[PDB]
């Protein structure tokens, strides 16, 4: 119901998010994923590291430069999981993937914007408690991603700025709600209450 | 598109091509190389289309073409036009 | 990775480094860092910024 949808990857499952996103792009919705480093996978760390190693040992033998390119970042892991769903070898699939943008962390201009979630892809809702899960920043740093220490240092600044913003907005909202409560009990407000507002 | 996944490639290429082609079409229209509408006075719809007669009447009204006229055919056209105007005059009278 | 966001040069430079910037030195007017030296004016607001 929007021109563009920003999705916070925190607390989500890679494959389910990939499925819903792919079917949205193929329908024509523009989507932007952020905080891929906080993304989650089902199963313990060991299993998924073993899986990535199984993927990593695969390579064209007579020339390694033309084989499966093993991208280490969480954004690229998610992009792989997604591209395997889309028929990316078609113009339709290319145009679909060109409606997508994946980012580690929340950079500008999306930091000053609203983010959403997908409840049929969240870990806490889809998984049963008492089940091991894996996080993608840890996995990528294990398999050779050399940037997890900068993204944390930057998110620690973004969060402070956002907290200042929220502390301002929350006092403004208190003022507004108090003024509205004082305006209430007027006959205009009674009519609005009757009509459902 | 793998080295830059967050950059559109094909949509930009197609934007470029469609604008490419639209400009060329508009200029081919401005240069009068495309044929006019069906009802315009200079149009040739329902008539016969022959570059020989077109060149004949153009050189009677009297920058590189493959269109010539074959003086043989020019003499033939003058002959047949004399016959045509003879018949028209016999209608005359 | 690492990104360069600004580079600052000195006021006066030698014909040697100017030659490094140039590829046909004997024909040029040698106009390399003129406007930068001009940007090194009274207080150097840009330089200090």
């Amino acid at each position: 119901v929007e021109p563009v949808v920003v999705i916070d990857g925190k607390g989500h499952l890679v494959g389910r998010l990939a499925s819903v996103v792919a079917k949205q792009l193929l329908n024509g919705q523009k989507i932007v994923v952020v905080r891929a480093e906080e993304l989650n996978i089902s199963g313990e760390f060991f299993r998924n590291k073993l899986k990535y190693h199984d993927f990593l040992r695969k390579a064209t033998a007579f020339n390694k430069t033309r084989g499966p390119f093993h991208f280490r970042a969480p954004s690229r892991i998610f992009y792989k999981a997604l591209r395997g769903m889309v028929s990316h070898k078609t113009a339709r699939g290319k145009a679909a993937l060109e409606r997508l943008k994946v980012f580690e962390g929340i950079p500008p201009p999306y930091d000053k914007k609203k983010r959403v979630v997908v409840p049929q892809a969240l870990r806490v809702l889809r998984l049963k408690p008492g089940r091991k899960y894996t996080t993608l920043g840890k996995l990528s740093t294990s398999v050779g991603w050399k940037y997890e220490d900068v993204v944390a240092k930057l998110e620690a600044k973004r969060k402070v700025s956002s907290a200042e913003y929220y502390a301002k907005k929350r006092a403004f909202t208190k003022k507004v709600a108090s003024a509205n409560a004082t305006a209430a009990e007027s006959d205009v407000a009674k009519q609005l209450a009757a009509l459902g507002y | 598109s793998k080295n830059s996944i967050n950059r559109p490639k094909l949509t930009s290429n197609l934007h470029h091509k469609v604008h490419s082609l639209n400009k060329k079409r508009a200029q081919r229209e401005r240069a009068g190389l495309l044929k006019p509408a069906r009802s315009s006075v200079n149009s040739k719809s329902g008539e016969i289309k022959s570059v020989a007669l077109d060149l004949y009447f153009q050189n009677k009204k009297n920058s590189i073409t493959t269109r010539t006229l074959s003086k043989k055919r020019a003499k033939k056209i003058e002959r047949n036009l004399k016959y045509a105007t003879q018949r028209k005059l016999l209608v005359d009278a | 990775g690492l990104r360069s966001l600004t580079t600052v040069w000195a006021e006066h430079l030698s014909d040697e480094v100017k030659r490094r910037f140039y590829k046909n030195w004997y024909k040029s007017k040698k106009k390399a860092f003129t406007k930068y030296s001009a940007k090194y004016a009274q207080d150097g607001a840009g330089i200090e910024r």
Binding site: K101 | R7, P8, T11 | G46
Partner: peptide, 27 residues
């Protein structure tokens, strides 16, 4: 800004990017 030419050059780059749709962050 840097106030001399970076302003014009950067706004022109961004508008070329937004007309050709060749921008990494913006659509």
């Amino acid at each position: 800004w840097r106030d001399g030419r970076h302003h014009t050059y950067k706004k022109a780059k961004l508008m070329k990017q937004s007309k050709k749709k060749t921008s990494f962050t913006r659509f």
